[PDB]
């Protein structure tokens, strides 16, 4: 059976969902969560619904959940594989944090794209040097990929 920690987090997520986020365990694999994040109001992602997958590895909570966007998104912190550049998903994960923390952090990133992340990339570089174009592209990608999904 699952560790008590995962059972409790799952119960709390279902009883008290994060506003603007759906998160539910898979019926075949209780470590596997199907996530949908609404594009935040006033962001370039408004109107979109973004599908993510989240998995809790055997060593959780000693290592971070594994997460990726399944819906394409144009964002300085999301790469072509859907991986998210967030320190708490990497070396700054702490067992004190939880699934809810991760979901809130990703949602916050959609409202506040961080192109100044030391891990430089071409999308982040464009958000820095030509924010107008980057936002236009993010809006176009929202319409193209994040609207007639789900």
């Amino acid at each position: 059976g699952l560790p008590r920690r995962i059972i409790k987090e799952t119960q709390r997520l279902l009883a008290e969902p994060v506003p603007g986020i759906k998160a539910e365990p898979d019926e075949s694999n209780a470590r596997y969560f199907h996530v949908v994040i609404a594009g935040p109001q006033d962001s370039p992602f408004e109107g979109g619904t973004f599908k993510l997958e989240l998995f809790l590895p055997e060593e959780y909570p000693m290592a971070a959940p594994k997460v990726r966007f399944m819906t394409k998104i144009y964002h300085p912190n999301v790469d072509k594989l859907g991986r998210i550049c967030l320190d708490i998903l990497k070396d700054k994960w702490s067992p004190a944090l939880q699934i809810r923390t991760v979901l809130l952090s990703i949602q916050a990133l959609l409202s506040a794209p961080n192109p100044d992340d030391p891990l430089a990339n071409d999308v982040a570089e464009q958000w820095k040097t030509n924010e107008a174009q980057a936002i236009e592209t993010a809006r176009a990608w929202t319409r193209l990929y994040a609207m007639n999904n789900i």
Binding site: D87, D91, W93, S94, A96, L97
Partner: protein, 238 residues
């Protein structure tokens, strides 16, 4: 380090020189010879990002295995850290889980149910051992946050004490820097001597470094040896 347990068995101090990572020098040999006049045994601790915390918790648990009166006091103070975490705004239930796990472990030692052998098995089980280690990261962070005004001067230009804790103390596998080392030892209420194989590595520029910097004549109750990549527990000859 491929094969090595989290917490080794006791070995004679003389076997320290058999380790292939040691500097090939008469200087290292001479220093190890000097130390072998004082110290009879060494217990290797896995040299990963958790090493310093692990060496300290091993040293502490060894004291408690020999002194129930100290163990009672330490259980009471660990229960009080649990209260303090909630007061300082740590996530309540996730942090309490680690506190509860560690305290239940100590209570089982105190009851007499755990033998010395049972304790060393638990300290070598990745799951249990890392839950226990996490309690020590939490009280180190709590100590810094509780005394934030006092330690703020020591934090790099960019950040607050809380940010430093979140980034450098709370995550597992984050090596303890000089401030973390001091904070852990004060939080745990212990006294440590660190012997250096190379005086250049010592934060006080001495052959050994006593923490906390007291000036009071009280023997350290845990002694560690530092070499590049390693904090190991060492034991004075009787």
């Amino acid at each position: 380090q491929k094969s090595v347990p989290l917490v080794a068995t006791l070995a004679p101090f003389s076997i320290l020189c058999a380790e292939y990572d040691n500097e090939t020098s008469a200087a290292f040999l001479s220093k190890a010879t000097e130390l072998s006049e004082v110290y009879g045994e060494i217990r290797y601790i896995r040299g990963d990002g958790n090493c310093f915390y692990r060496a300290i918790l091993v040293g502490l648990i060894e004291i408690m295995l020999k002194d129930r009166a100290r163990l009672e006091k330490f259980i009471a103070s660990s229960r009080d850290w649990t209260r303090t975490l909630v007061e300082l705004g740590f996530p309540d239930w996730t942090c309490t889980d680690f506190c509860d796990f560690f305290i239940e472990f100590l209570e089982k030692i105190h009851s007499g149910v755990h033998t010395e052998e049972a304790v060393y098995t638990i300290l070598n089980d990745d799951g249990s051992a890392n839950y226990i280690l996490m309690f020590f990261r939490l009280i180190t962070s709590a100590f810094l946050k509780q005394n934030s005004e006092e330690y703020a001067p020591f934090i790099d230009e960019g950040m607050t004490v809380a940010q430093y804790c979140e980034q450098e103390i709370e995550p597992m596998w984050k090596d303890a820097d000089h401030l973390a080392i001091n904070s852990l030892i004060k939080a745990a209420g212990t006294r440590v001597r660190i012997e250096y194989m190379d005086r250049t590595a010592a934060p006080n520029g001495g052959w050994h470094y006593d923490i906390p910097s007291d000036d009071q004549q009280i023997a350290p109750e845990i002694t560690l040896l530092y070499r590049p990549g390693h904090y190991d527990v060492i034991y004075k000859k009787d």
